[PDB]
Amino acid sequence: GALEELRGQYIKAVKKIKCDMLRYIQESKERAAEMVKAEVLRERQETARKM
Amino acid sequence: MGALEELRGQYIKAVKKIKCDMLRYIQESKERAAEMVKAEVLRERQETARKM
Amino acid sequence: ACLNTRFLEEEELRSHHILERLDAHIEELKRESEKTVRQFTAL
Amino acid sequence: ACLNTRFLEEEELRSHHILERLDAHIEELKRES
């Protein structure tokens, strides 16, 4: 009844909080992965040097 | 009445733990990012050595 | 190079762990609240 | 460096944002409670 519904709301509210943190953490990984490409591209400047 | 306070208390505790976890995760992530700044200034030693 | 890839691999590991801790705080909420409901519903 | 300093800057901004909106959402449901 009222108590079980109130429970479902608190549960659904925290799960939303979890979704926000998830999207954030996924964006973390993408950013650190984008770093990888960025470092590979500055190696390009040094391999032009070596030619 | 007391059930309402309990359920409210349990929600608050859940989210306050999530915030504590994110606070520590973030502080750790920024230190790891700062460590990546040091480690690479040190990689210019190889460049400045090449320049010597 | 290998600083950043190893950085990412670390990120991946920390991503899984913080994820566990969030699922924990949720599962604990589900158990605590289910008990509050069950017992007050007996009233 | 300017790569990784640019990186640390942005994580500062986006981590502050995530904490802001979370502190908002706790203030939200407690005032709803």
Author numbering:
A (entry chain B): 1205 to 1255
B (entry chain D): 1204 to 1255
C (entry chain C): 498 to 540
D (entry chain A): 498 to 530
Paper text:
The centrosome, which plays a central role as the main microtubule (MT)-organizing center for animal cell division, is a membraneless organelle composed of a pair of orthogonally arranged MT-derived apparatus, called centrioles, and the surrounding pericentriolar material (PCM). Here, we demonstrate that two of the human PCM scaffolds, Cep63 and Cep15212–14, cooperate to generate a higher-order cylindrical self-assembly capable of recruiting their downstream components, such as Plk4, a key regulator of centriole duplication. Remarkably, short (~50 residues) coiled-coil heterotetramerization regions of Cep63 and Cep152 and their neighboring hydrophobic motifs (i.e., Cep63 P1 and Cep152 M4d) were necessary and sufficient to generate the cylindrical self-assembly capable of recruiting its guest molecules critical for centriole duplication in vivo.
However, our effort to determine the crystal structure of the P1•M4d complex was unsuccessful because of heavy precipitation caused by the hydrophobic motifs within P1 and M4d. As expected, a smaller Cep63 P1b5(502–541)•Cep152 M4e15(1205–1257) complex lacking the hydrophobic motifs maintained its 2:2 heterotetrameric state (expected MW 25.56 kDa) without forming any detectable high MW complex. Size-exclusion chromatography-multi-angle light scattering (SEC-MALS) performed with decreasing concentrations of the complex revealed an apparent biphasic mode of MW changes, suggesting that the heterotetramer dissociates in two distinct steps with estimated Kd values of ~117 μM and ~60 μM. In particular, identical hydrophobic residues in the parallelly aligned Cep152 helices appeared to constitute the backbone of the bundle by engaging in pairwise ladder-like interactions (top). Cep63 helices did not directly interact with each other, but rather interacted with both Cep152 helices in an antiparallel fashion (middle and bottom).
